[PDB]
Design a protein around this ligand. Structure first.
Ligand SMILES: C=C(C)CCOP(=O)(O)OP(=O)(O)O
Ligand SMILES: [Cl-]
Ligand SMILES: [Mg+2]
Ligand SMILES: [Mg+2]
Ligand SMILES: [Mg+2]
Ligand SMILES: [Mg+2]
Ligand SMILES: [Mg+2]
Ligand SMILES: [Mg+2]
Lengths: 287, 286
């Protein structure tokens, strides 16, 4: 049974929030000098994206009683960090991809040196945007956002995940603990901080923060498990490690835990519920 | 006339402060999981360095009435950012160097992918160390350090400088404006924030912060001008753009402005003065 309001239109909500996010991104990082670095940063940042991390941040902030206005810099920051992770991941020294967000990868247009530096500058600007542009929130909470984002993106999060992912590439012995580590760190950490950052800015209790963290962790993992089921319902995977049946049950357990974490809230949780209902629905429609 | 105390031993002061910084670096970033990323980050971070940016930070904090203790996380952060700039600069796609800090470059040991990621994780950890580990400093000051370091290291500072440096590589038309931009942004920005960050944490006035910023900007530029004079006393340079004589006068004007900026202070400014006296002394001896 879908948790969100029966009429909730997720496609419509995401489209509006995407436009709002993309207008904020354009204004927060305007063309500046030297033109080439700002051109390269904006090339990747403003390329077509779903903007799910910023949208989760704004939604979590609102759910916790805050405004979009206080969260928008942090929302932009999450997208800058996500964008710089893709720029670095696409590089010839990493995945060596020719295409990203429907255009040539940054390094194909600007060279590997400029792409690396554009990534470095977007990572740095994420922290500046939060520190310099976050309105009304007391410094102590903005610093908590800085610390949480930094922990989520570095060796304890996104980069730690990227490293184990790279170490796993040539191997035939990847176990569930490794696969779980990659999903929770390479992708999970930043999803978690996207919702938790919104709650911190709003001044939410540690309890509320932890409920959103659980939501994000479980919905993130449910997404990866269902993705692996879809791949074979058409290199360690949930099916290759658990079998198909236990993968289906795990996905259902993950969605149930995600929905439970935000069960207490009213209509402000509808966007997060709709995201879970959609991922649930895609799971059920194979069975 | 040297501005610092007659007996001030800069070599001794730097060696003691280097030891303190390197102990802090080892404790703030201990080996952790996955081991390979922490090993790569520590490989470059704990390689032989003069540690001038952390030392400037600690010295500036103390000059402003603060302790080394409140500044040590920020000092480590400045060294992390400096270290990640060298890791990325050494990459095949950039300067393609085989050696850094007396050992093989990070990417020669760990591969280009791990070196990139080590650099990204050091950049990130710099902001975490300031925000998480700064001991009992008012949040508003710590947030100003985050904003100032981010501005100093990004497209408005260090990265902006690296980019114009890369764009200048193949050119025969590099003018004084461009050379000045590279020196003030690629190198100057992070020196400036090293001294200003210490002062901010200590709760120094805007005025004091601005005087330390002038000190760092002028001493940084004086260093680059004198380096160019030494190179030909042995590609746009101060001599190739100004000629030798105006380069010498410029260097002396820069050191004079640097010393004037901190003239008012007592013995707590002696380390900054001794750094200026040493750079002056190297100029005059040619
Ligand atoms: C989280 C990061 C660093 C990006 C994911 O890169 P992958 O190689 O896993 O996938 P793509 O986004 O490149 O397709
Ligand atoms: Cl996504
Ligand atoms: Mg990859
Ligand atoms: Mg990829
Ligand atoms: Mg998968
Ligand atoms: Mg270089
Ligand atoms: Mg170099
Ligand atoms: Mg030179």
């Amino acid at each position: 049974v879908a948790s969100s309001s029966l009429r909730f239109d997720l496609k419509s909500y995401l489209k509006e929030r995407q436009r709002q996010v993309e207008a904020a991104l354009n204004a927060i990082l305007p063309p500046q000098d030297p033109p080439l670095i700002y051109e390269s940063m904006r090339y990747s940042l403003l390329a077509e994206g779903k903007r799910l991390r910023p949208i989760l941040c704004l939604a979590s902030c609102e759910l916790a009683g805050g405004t979009a206005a206080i969260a928008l810099p942090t929302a932009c920051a999450l997208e800058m960090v996500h964008t710089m992770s893709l720029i670095h991941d696409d590089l010839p020294s990493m995945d060596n991809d020719d295409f990203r967000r429907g255009r040539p990868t940054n390094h194909k247009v600007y060279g590997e040196d400029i792409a690396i530096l554009a990534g470095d500058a977007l990572l740095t600007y994420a922290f500046e945007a939060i520190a310099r542009h976050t309105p009304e929130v007391p410094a102590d909470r903005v610093l908590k956002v800085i610390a949480a984002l930094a922990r989520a993106v570095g060796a304890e999060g996104l980069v730690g995940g990227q490293v184990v992912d790279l170490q796993s590439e040539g191997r035939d012995d990847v176990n569930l603990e490794t696969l779980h580590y990659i999903h929770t760190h390479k992708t999970g950490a930043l999803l978690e901080v996207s919702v938790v950052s919104g709650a911190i800015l709003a001044g939410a209790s540690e309890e509320l923060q932890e409920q959103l963290r659980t939501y994000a962790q479980k919905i993130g993992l449910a997404f990866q498990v269902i993705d692996d089921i879809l791949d074979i319902t058409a290199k360690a995977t949930y099916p290759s490690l658990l079998g198909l049946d236990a993968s289906r049950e795990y996905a259902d357990q993950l969605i149930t835990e995600a929905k439970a974490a935000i069960a207490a809230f009213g209509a402000e949780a509808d966007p997060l519920r709709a995201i879970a209902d959609y991922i649930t629905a895609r799971k059920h429609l194979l069975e």
